[PDB]
Amino acid sequence: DLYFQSTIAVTGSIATDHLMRFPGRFSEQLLPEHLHKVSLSFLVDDLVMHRGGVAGNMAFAIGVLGGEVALVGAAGADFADYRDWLKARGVNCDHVLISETAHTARFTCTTDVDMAQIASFYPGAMSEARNIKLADVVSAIGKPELVIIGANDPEAMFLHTEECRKLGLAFAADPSQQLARLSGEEIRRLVNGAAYLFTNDYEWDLLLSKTGWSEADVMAQIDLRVTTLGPKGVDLVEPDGTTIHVGVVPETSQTDPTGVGDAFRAGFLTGRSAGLGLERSAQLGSLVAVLVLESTGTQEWQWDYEAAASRLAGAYGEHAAAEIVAVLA
Amino acid sequence: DLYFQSTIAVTGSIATDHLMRFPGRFSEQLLPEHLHKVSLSFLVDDLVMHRGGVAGNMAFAIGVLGGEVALVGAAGADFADYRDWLKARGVNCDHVLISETAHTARFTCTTDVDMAQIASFYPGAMSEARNIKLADVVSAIGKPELVIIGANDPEAMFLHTEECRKLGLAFAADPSQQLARLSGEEIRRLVNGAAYLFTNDYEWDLLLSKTGWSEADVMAQIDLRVTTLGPKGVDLVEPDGTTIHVGVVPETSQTDPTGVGDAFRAGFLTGRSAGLGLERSAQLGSLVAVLVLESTGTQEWQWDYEAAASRLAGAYGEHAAAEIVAVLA
Ligand SMILES: Nc1ncnc2c1ncn2[C@@H]1O[C@@H](CO)[C@@H](O)[C@H]1O
Numbered sequence: 001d002l003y004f005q006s007t008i009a010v011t012g013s014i015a016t017d018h019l020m021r022f023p024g025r026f027s028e029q030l031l032p033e034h035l036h037k038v039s040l041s042f043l044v045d046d047l048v049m050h051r052g053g054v055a056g057n058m059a060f061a062i063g064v065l066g067g068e069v070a071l072v073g074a075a076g077a078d079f080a081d082y083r084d085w086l087k088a089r090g091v092n093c094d095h096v097l098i099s100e101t102a103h104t105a106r107f108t109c110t111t112d113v114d115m116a117q118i119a120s121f122y123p124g125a126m127s128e129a130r131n132i133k134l135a136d137v138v139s140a141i142g143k144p145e146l147v148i149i150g151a152n153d154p155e156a157m158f159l160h161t162e163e164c165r166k167l168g169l170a171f172a173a174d175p176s177q178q179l180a181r182l183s184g185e186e187i188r189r190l191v192n193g194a195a196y197l198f199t200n201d202y203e204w205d206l207l208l209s210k211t212g213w214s215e216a217d218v219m220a221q222i223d224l225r226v227t228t229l230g231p232k233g234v235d236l237v238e239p240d241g242t243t244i245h246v247g248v249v250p251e252t253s254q255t256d257p258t259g260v261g262d263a264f265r266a267g268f269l270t271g272r273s274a275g276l277g278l279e280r281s282a283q284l285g286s287l288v289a290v291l292v293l294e295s296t297g298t299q300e301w302q303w304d305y306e307a308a309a310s311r312l313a314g315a316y317g318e319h320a321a322a323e324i325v326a327v328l329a
Numbered sequence: 330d331l332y333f334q335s336t337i338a339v340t341g342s343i344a345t346d347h348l349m350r351f352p353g354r355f356s357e358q359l360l361p362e363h364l365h366k367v368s369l370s371f372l373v374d375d376l377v378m379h380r381g382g383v384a385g386n387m388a389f390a391i392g393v394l395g396g397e398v399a400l401v402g403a404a405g406a407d408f409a410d411y412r413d414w415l416k417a418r419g420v421n422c423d424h425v426l427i428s429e430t431a432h433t434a435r436f437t438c439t440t441d442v443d444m445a446q447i448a449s450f451y452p453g454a455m456s457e458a459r460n461i462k463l464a465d466v467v468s469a470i471g472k473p474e475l476v477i478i479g480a481n482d483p484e485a486m487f488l489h490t491e492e493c494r495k496l497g498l499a500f501a502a503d504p505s506q507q508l509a510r511l512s513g514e515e516i517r518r519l520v521n522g523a524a525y526l527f528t529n530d531y532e533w534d535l536l537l538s539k540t541g542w543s544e545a546d547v548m549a550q551i552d553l554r555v556t557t558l559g560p561k562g563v564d565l566v567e568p569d570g571t572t573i574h575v576g577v578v579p580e581t582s583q584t585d586p587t588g589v590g591d592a593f594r595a596g597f598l599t600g601r602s603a604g605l606g607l608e609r610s611a612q613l614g615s616l617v618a619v620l621v622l623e624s625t626g627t628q629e630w631q632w633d634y635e636a637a638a639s640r641l642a643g644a645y646g647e648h649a650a651a652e653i654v655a656v657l658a
């Protein structure tokens with residue numbers, strides 16, 4: 001592709017999140033005989049609304065961190081206010097498709113005492129993301145260094161990936177939130193040639209369960225597997241074997257785990273974009289991740305290059321801290 | 330209790346239900362390693378709003394069937410319209426507590442291809458049900474023949490049960506939807522002296538799991554256990570052993586399983602109130618149940634004493650049909 005260069009393009013959902021808390025344990029209610037057919041209803045304690053969508057969340061964090069970033073997804077007419085919120089953190093919202101008729105997607109999530117999460121996602125306007133052409137985005141802003149293919153309209157996820165394939169754009173397969181809806185055929189066609197494959201360990205097992213793939217089958221198709229491991233940090237795997245592991249940044253609170261994955265990805269890719277190695281990028285990712293864990297909502301954390309250095313030092317040593325803080329603003 | 334007699338009083342929730350469909354299988358996404366901590370998000374196909382709440386649903390069906398019924402629960406100021414809907418089917422709504430400040434409860438439910446259900450319930454005004462005194466209801470309308478203690482504000486469930494205990498009113502323990510939220514101590518104190526204990530088989534196992542009780546411990550405290558069994562119908566158990574079983578009324582469609590339990594209970598109790606035996610009452614219950622299964626929403630079915638006779642005959646024989654249709658309007 002001989003077109004001019006220029007950014008991270010974040011594709012994926014744009015939504016309003018309704019986050020609720022169940023003051024009990026989901027596992028305790030999940031009987032393994034009855035898992036053939038669940039019958040679950042959780043009386044919640046709390047209900048609160050925040051800006052969301054995987055693409056919204058990732059684009060926001062890249063912007064906070066000072067990265068150049070374009071948000072590419074479909075929203076309802078209601079988007080104008082959310083746009084202003086994103087633009088305030090430097091997010092390019094020019095290529096957001098605004099539906100003439102449909103409402104911005106709605107996420108309804110319940111979190112339990114162990115940070116387990118059970119949620120529904122109503123697409124609304126998201127379904128129109130299949131009508132967005134990345135070719136038009138590239139035309140206007142140049143080739144991005146990376147396109148993130150986040151959870152989105154299932155058809156859009158594939159069309160965007162195919163467009164990256166034919167445009168010769170590097171892409172990160174980040175199907176996370178959609179693995180439950182996507183068939184094994186649908187997951188398989190998103191993976192080949194990915195610079196990065198992002199998931200957590202559950203989703204990793206779900207992917208391999210539904211694809212019929214072994215880990216070896218996947219590593220042959222991708223440049224890097226990134227698998228977050230909850231409290232055990234993150235694994236960075238290479239073509240066949242080499243594995244870098246970074247442990248979490250210890251949390252002061254487990255408030256709300258929504259968007260923790262999105263935040264890690266944004267920090268990590270920002271790190272990678274700034275010439276940081278895999279280990280250092282994952283350490284920065286882990287910090288943004290914990291900042292999200294300690295706040296309610298996905299985009300309600302702050303940046304403060306002083307507190308960042310301090311925390312990174314405390315978890316990873318002062319070499320890590322100094323290396324990360326430097327390659328930034 | 331030497332106060333004058335008169336009705337079924339239905340206590341439990343009053344809500345707005347948001348019902349969604351996941352065009353996949355929950356079980357297929359539920360990995361049994363990862364059940365320690367789930368991470369589930371379902372892209373849904375459909376979102377629709379209907380009148381709901383266990384008490385709303387049960388009171389509605391008793392009313393449709395021509396029964397005398399009083400609805401006792403807490404709702405928001407928004408209740409006026411829902412009231413008119415209930416009154417149109419003969420439901421006494423005089424003893425509904427209307428919150429000055431809080432919103433009518435919200436149920437958000439996702440149903441999969443196998444009729445499994447995963448849901449959140451936001452109490453809002455329901456929490457004020459703990460301020461309702463059944464003594465005041467009894468004062469105004471006389472002693473009901475039965476009080477149903479449906480899923481409600483957890484504290485209200487117990488206060489209502491205690492009030493039935495001291496007022497000497499027969500009550501049906503129907504904790505179904507709240508078993509997930511209630512502790513084992515909280516479930517245990519709802520059961521003693523119940524004329525009926527209603528659940529499905531999952532909830533039955535959940536109850537015994539969380540109470541630390543054996544089936545024998547429960548049967549010693551209640552007059553009858555009624556355990557619905559999905560496609561395998563319903564078990565009616567007696568103090569120690571005698572078990573009547575009634576199989577389902579074969580469905581023409583599996584549209585929406587929400588409120589199927591509530592409908593069975595309403596039909597069964599209506600049957601019991603009309604001097605029908607346990608078997609005949611469960612057969613009538615099973616019909617209301619299938620009528621709910623075949624419609625979207627909980628209160629969107631109809632009555633048509635001609636089609637009722639026909640269906641009952643087809644499933645249970647024409648003796649059953651004639652016996653049930655007779656003791657009604
Ligand atoms: N199935 C889904 N499809 C697209 N986005 C989703 C889905 N489930 C959750 N999300 C978004 O992902 C979360 C953060 O990772 C929320 O902000 C929510 O809006």
Ligand SMILES: Nc1ncnc2c1ncn2[C@@H]1O[C@@H](CO)[C@@H](O)[C@H]1O
Binds near residue numbers: 343344383588
């Ligand atoms: N946890 C709960 N507490 C009270 N009512 C509930 C709960 N979960 C579901 N419901 C109500 O029960 C359903 C029917 O049984 C819905 O109409 C819903 O409003």
